[PDB]
Design a protein around this nucleic acid. Structure first.
Lengths: 82, 639, 85, 205
RNA sequence: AAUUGAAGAGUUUGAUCAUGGCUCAGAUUGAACGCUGGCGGCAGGCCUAACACAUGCAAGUCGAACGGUAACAGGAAGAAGCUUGCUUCUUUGCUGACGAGUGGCGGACGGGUGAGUAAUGUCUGGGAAACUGCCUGAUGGAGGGGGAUAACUACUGGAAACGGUAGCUAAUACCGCAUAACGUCGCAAGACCAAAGAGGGGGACCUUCGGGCCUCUUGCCAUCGGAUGUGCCCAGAUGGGAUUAGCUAGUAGGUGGGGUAACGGCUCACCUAGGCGACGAUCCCUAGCUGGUCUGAGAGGAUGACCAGCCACACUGGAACUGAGACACGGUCCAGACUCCUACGGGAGGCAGCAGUGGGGAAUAUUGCACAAUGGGCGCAAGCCUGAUGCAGCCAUGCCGCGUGUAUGAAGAAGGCCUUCGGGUUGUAAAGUACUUUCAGCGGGGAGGAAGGGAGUAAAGUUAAUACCUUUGCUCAUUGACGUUACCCGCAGAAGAAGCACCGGCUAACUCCGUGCCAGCAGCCGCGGUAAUACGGAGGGUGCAAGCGUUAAUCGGAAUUACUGGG
């Protein structure tokens, strides 16, 4: 089952999640079809927040992929009308 | 909570350690074989122990009675390597020596019994083998008073016969003289009148803490009469365990053995506190050393435990463990100790068999140092001849038996290095020549050794006048003369040196400071040839103590001994005399006091006095010397 | 090895008996068709093929067959019985 | 890290002036300069071709105090930079925070300016910085915190800067201890005495 | 804007010029050893024995699949005490839920190892004869019956492990039948093939009062798809040796049958007599592949340990089942070795899972905390499980940053060393004096990683329904292993924190004393048979810094393996 999920990287005590499409059987740091955006929770308010390429994600929703609840919240945080 | 460890001073092969195996049946079962005659389990532990008829080292087993713990270990009284049993006194303040029924307590046990006084902990005699003929039911028990040298009295006594009464006593009317010494009990004696014996048990409880007298006991364990009810007194008579748990934990190592299935386990009692399993602790090395595993030494079988109680003693594995190492730090206890008063009890060679397999036997000699701490050895000899610090006859059999099982090597040696110190017989002219008659180096000097009084050692002086003496090159002449004192013509070490060098012509353009050093050694082997050789041997004095009644039998050993008579003085029933015999035969003197003394023999000495000299033939030990520069040229000097 | 999930082993043992029993009774119906071809009786071959068609397709729904091997039995075997016809 | 040794003795080893003892006093001349670097400094060196390079590398280091391993990182960082390496290496050493504070007259000798940074006194762009290796950004506004401001020793040290040439690439407010770095210094402005070309040759092999 | 980059010296000889090896200056490692050692951040940490392993744990979960209740918590008929509604307390699956048991899914993923493997492997680019549970799009079906069995009882074998026989009972277990199509087979006619229901709520109607019925959500069955995953085919590329030149007999192809999800000698039957090999077949030695890492101007050389992909392996050897997927790390069956248990009848065991122990070796860790976060498994969900992961503890192993103070300070002292004993040097060094306090020590504040989820409320959908449910706003109560955190403030006091190599040339930096080709140093040349600038010690200096040397592997220098680039 293909799914969109954070890959979790960065320096120790410095989380830097990597939203990416990958089958569930794959490891969190393992093989993935393609990266799409990134999430930086420790970034706080500055020039960078949380890029999110909805265009490629809109294609995988029709491919049957199951967005994770973490990425699903990012779909709301990016909003539509806002 | 806990309980003090029981003693096991079965001196003179009293077999009181075999009576301890009966105590495990009394504390049994609920599931146990109950022991058997001979060997036999009884926590035998290592292989080839019960097959020898006695254990090679003191053991230990778990036990309990009266709703209290009652650890104990035995025997260590065999031989011969009794100093190891002295290390067990630190394992428990208790004592329970088994005096023999034949003429009172054996005299060899009196040495272990007098050593218990130095421990400062209480002990009690026991009537081992009471169910036997010839037993001192009223005569031999008096011999324990003369040997105890105090005022101890049995709490009960009987004579049999099938009967083995013990509680029927004891010490009516006259008994209670130890209470008279108590400051409180002596005041109750002034009041007069009869009183309950339990009232005098409080004052005897104070004197028991000072160990003023051995507690009473009777009945052989084989008869199964009194060997169990007398064990109840060990529970009440023994001092209570110093329970706490307040921390911080502290202790010290007691004994260890290299079990084949171990391979190591340095057991040590907990002097205070408690150590949690799988947790780091302090040590004498000043580094962290967690106990990865630890278990109580149950008599029926080893058993793990998550944490030792306070005051308990149990084996535990470790990567390293120096003997007597603080578990804290640090333990705060003090007592006297000795290895039976003997720095070296007749060293014996043990060269391993095979030109290569003997070398692996040397590593097993490091394994003897992992066993009993009273052990030492070093390859001081140029041949690397073994020189073990172990002594005694039967005690050597355990070290030799251990080689047939724990390892795969063995050796037989006993004579040792001769220790000769040959000296020149008289002074004579000599010279290294001049120019190049001749052989290298061209530098030469005329050595002129002279006789000296025995024990004076080597000597030399710079007779040559400057600058020919050489402010710097002349020192090599002395350093080169020392090379010729490493061995005479017969290979014996140089002694009574007195080489006053004089003439020393030399050519400057080709002369070197090593050239004079080389010609200097030839001056010592040429001038030693005029000496004609003079062999001498050490003759250190060896004082010894023997009983006066046997003292007349010690004068017969004098004619066989090479030593000459010396001054001595009697000391009450004990007697002693100041001998002085050569070290080549001194190692056999120990065998003479073990026989003519009847077990009362004792002696001690130390090397002294290089002078000696004795026949015959003037044999010398080769060889000297090799692996040195220009050594093949000294062969040309012979002809 | 002791495990709480050892039930999968005994159940696979309990399953394989009932599973092979269906695979065994089906193949014996298949070997029976081959006996009709060697006999030369083209008419009895058409009847034995009819007996196995409902049961062999039925196993494929049960997962015993990957519904591709069963088709091969409906393929080459049908090419034999009609060639004799 | 810090050499913490006889700083004034090191000047005689180079024969010029490492300014390790600029002092509230002006010129020293108490240590016998040049003629006696040490016990055997009277000897005239052969001055080997390898010696002129090592003599120049240790000279630039001791003026800044940079350790040899950390100093090699400035050379690798300067090779990737645009333009000639000769200027880029001195610029990043001028980009150190302890050096810019020294240019402001904050502290006397450079060793004082480093420790002044270390005790949370410096606060560049409104953010305190302890590290002396800090890479100052263009148009930074370094200034000491109000609790550490005008603490006696800081006031007399500024008087020495009046005799100093005073860089053109930076300026201090003086009336409130507020410095302000601007453009990166030109090679013509800084130094104009040491041979920076020699340093690159040492790492060229 | 995105590789702007190539250095050399010593040493053959009385001297030189070429040729020609050795050696040094560079960077670097999964390093060790020796000495020293304050702290922080980020990583790495069994490369030797794919050697043997104590103990714990590492994959469980769903009652919204079903019979059940073994415990626990409530309710109820009934009971006993007695302050008769206060308490005592038997029954009771009637509820909240939950062992054992049936059944669905996972266990083929995650995690580890490099033994095996020179091609059955992998990398690179193609190819058709495929498969794919879970996820998802589209169209339909979802009708009606039967028989057993675990659990549970009676009895019984065995020490245990673990059953046996005879009976009772359910399901989304199993099994015929009805029903089917663009599905399967066939040229077509025609033949044949599947299943399961639960949970929430409810007006009328209908209740033998088991419930029907309406509606929402989810599951199930068939087909065509989509994606993902896997298998299969070929070409090229992917180690050493010719002192391995012949190799092969299911061996090459054809034909038919059988076999695989699928092609194929994949395997039997017969026929043909071929196939591969010097552009290196068989054999022999060795090796996990590769993205990369290190070195180098480049070309390349070495390597590929961590990170990541594929593959191989799971005590040894072999075999098969269950299943979409295994011919299988924490499955089954069997041989064998090695351990352990027994009541010796018979069974148990496979740490190359994380820790840990023994052994090996120069040499590498805690039997830690928590599922707070992510991911995976199950569940409608809440939650449970996770030695994955997130951390912590340990080691200077490597990189990086910082401290061990700063300024003043001449009698230019004491001591040490050197001397032409005139003096110089150690040396602004220390003492003195003036300040400062990072980091550690101690005492208070204190981010961020946290999004959700639960309860409640309003509205929009759904619907007979303002109920349920779905979804979006909103309120209250909250979820941190790390963690006595980061960080900040405050307190005392220059207070607790500098070593190591080297000093003949190469190669930055010296004298003196001791030892006299003795003792010893050494990477190359080589020193010491003399106040040795090359030994030992001291003074001084240099190099570098919590590291400094030594040793080893590899590259560069070495254009002394030259393809770029030699004879």
């Amino acid at each position: 089952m293909v799914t969109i999920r954070l890959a979790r990287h960065g320096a120790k005590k410095r989380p830097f999640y990597q939203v990416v499409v990958a089958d569930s059987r794959n490891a969190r740091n393992g093989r993935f079809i393609e990266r799409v955006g990134f999430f930086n929770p420790i970034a706080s308010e500055k020039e960078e927040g949380t890029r999110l390429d909805l265009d490629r994600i809109a294609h995988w929703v029709g491919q049957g992929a199951t967005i994770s609840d973490r990425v699903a919240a990012l779909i709301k945080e990016v909003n539509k009308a806002a | 909570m806990k309980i003090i460890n029981i003693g096991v001073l079965a001196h003179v092969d009293a077999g009181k350690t075999t009576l301890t195996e009966s105590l495990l049946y009394n504390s049994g079962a609920i599931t146990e074989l109950g022991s058997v005659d001979k060997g036999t389990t009884r926590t035998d532990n290592t292989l080839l122990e019960r097959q020898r008829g006695i254990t090679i080292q003191t053991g230990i087993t778990s036990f309990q009675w009266e709703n209290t713990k009652v650890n104990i270990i035995d025997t260590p009284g065999h031989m011969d390597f009794l100093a190891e049993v002295y290390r067990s006194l630190s394992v428990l303040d208790g004592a329970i020596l088994l005096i023999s029924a034949k003429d009172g307590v054996q005299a060899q046990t009196r040495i272990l019994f007098h050593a218990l006084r130095k421990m400062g902990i209480p002990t009690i005699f026991f009537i081992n083998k009471i169910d036997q003929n010839g037993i001192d039911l009223s005569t031999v028990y008096q011999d324990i008073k003369e040997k105890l040298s105090a005022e101890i009295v049995i709490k009960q006594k009987v004579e049999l016969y099938p009967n083995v009464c013990v509680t029927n006593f004891t010490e009516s009317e006259q008994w209670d003289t130890v209470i008279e010494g108590n400051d409180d009990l002596l005041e109750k004696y002034m009041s007069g009148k009869s009183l309950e014996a339990l009232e005098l048990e409080q004052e005897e409880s104070i004197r028991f803490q000072n160990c003023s007298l051995f507690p009473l006991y009777h009945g052989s364990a084989k008869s199964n009469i009194g060997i169990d009810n007398l064990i109840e007194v060990i529970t009440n008579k023994f001092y209570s365990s110093t329970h706490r748990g307040p921390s911080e934990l502290c202790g010290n190592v007691f004994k260890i053995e290299y079990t084949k299935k171990r391979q190591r386990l340095a057991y040590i009692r907990l002097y205070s506190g408690v150590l949690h399993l799988r947790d780091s602790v302090r040590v004498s090395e000043k580094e962290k050393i967690k106990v990865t595993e630890m278990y109580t030494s149950i008599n029926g079988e080893l058993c793990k435990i998550d944490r030792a109680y306070s005051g308990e003693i149990v084996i535990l594995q470790n990567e390293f463990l120096k003997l007597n190492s603080v578990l804290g730090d640090t333990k705060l206890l003090p007592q006297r100790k000795k290895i039976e008063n003997p720095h070296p009890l007749l060293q014996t060679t043990v060269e391993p068999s095979k030109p290569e397999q003997r070398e692996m036997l040397l590593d097993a000699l490091l394994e003897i140092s992992d066993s009993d701490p009273l052990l030492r050895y070093y390859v001081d000899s140029t041949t690397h001849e073994i020189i073990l610090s172990f002594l005694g006859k039967v005690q050597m059999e355990v070290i030799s038996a251990l080689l047939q099982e724990k390892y795969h090597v063995e050796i037989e040696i006993t004579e040792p290095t001769v220790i000769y110190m040959e000296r020149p017989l008289k002074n004579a002219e000599y010279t290294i020549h001049i120019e190049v008659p001749p052989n290298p180096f061209w530098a030469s000097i005329g050595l002129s050794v002279s006789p000296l009084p025995l024990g004076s050692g080597m000597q030399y002086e710079s007779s040559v006048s400057l600058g020919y003496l050489n402010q710097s090159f002349q020192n090599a002449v002395m350093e080169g003369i020392r090379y010729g004192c490493e061995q005479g013509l017969y290979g014996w070490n140089v002694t009574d040196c007195k080489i006053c060098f004089k003439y020393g012509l030399y050519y400057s353009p080709v002369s070197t400071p090593a050239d004079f050093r080389m010609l200097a050694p030839i001056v010592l082997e040429q001038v030693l040839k005029k000496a004609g050789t003079e062999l001498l041997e050490p003759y250190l004095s060896f004082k010894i103590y023997a009983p006066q009644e046997y003292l007349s039998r010690a004068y017969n050993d004098a004619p066989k001994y090479c030593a000459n008579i010396v001054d001595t003085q009697l000391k009450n029933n004990e007697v002693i005399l100041s001998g002085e015999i050569p070290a080549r035969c001194i190692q056999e003197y120990r065998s003479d006091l073990t026989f003519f003394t009847n077990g009362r023999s004792v002696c001690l000495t130390e090397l002294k006095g290089y002078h000696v000299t004795t026949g015959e033939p003037v044999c010398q030990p080769r060889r000297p010397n090799s692996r040195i520069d220009k050594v093949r040229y000294m062969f040309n000097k012979i002809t | 090895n002791i495990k709480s999930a050892k039930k999968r082993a005994i159940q696979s043992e309990k399953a394989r008996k009932h599973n092979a029993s269906r695979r065994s009774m089906m193949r014996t119906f298949i070997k029976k068709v081959y006996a009709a071809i060697e006999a030369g009786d083209k008419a009895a071959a058409q009847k034995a093929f009819n007996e196995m068609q409902p049961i062999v397709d039925r196993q494929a729904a049960k997962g015993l067959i990957h519904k591709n091997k069963a088709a091969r039995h409906k393929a080459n075997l049908t090419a034999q019985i009609n060639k004799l016809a | 890290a810090r050499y913490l040794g006889p700083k004034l003795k090191l000047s005689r080893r180079e024969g010029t002036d490492l300014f390790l003892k600029s002092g509230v006093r002006a010129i020293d001349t108490k240590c016998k300069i040049e003629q006696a670097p040490g016990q055997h400094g009277a000897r005239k060196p052969r001055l080997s071709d390898y010696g002129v390079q090592l003599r120049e590398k240790q000279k630039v280091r001791r003026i800044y105090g940079v350790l040899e391993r950390q100093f090699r990182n400035y050379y690798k960082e300067a090779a990737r930079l645009k333009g000639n390496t000769g200027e880029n290496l001195l610029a990043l050493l001028e980009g150190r925070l302890d050096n810019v504070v020294y240019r402001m007259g904050f502290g006397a000798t450079r060793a004082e300016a480093r420790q002044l940074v270390s005790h949370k006194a410096i606060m560049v762009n409104g953010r305190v910085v302890n590290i002396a290796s800090y890479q100052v950004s263009p148009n930074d506004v370094v200034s000491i915190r109000e609790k550490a401001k005008k603490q006696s020793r800081v006031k007399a040290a500024l008087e020495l800067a009046e005799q100093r040439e005073k860089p053109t690439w930076l300026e201090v407010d003086a009336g409130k201890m507020e410095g302000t770095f601007k453009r990166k210094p030109e090679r013509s402005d800084l130094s104009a005495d040491i041979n920076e070309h020699l340093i690159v040759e040492l790492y060229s092999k």
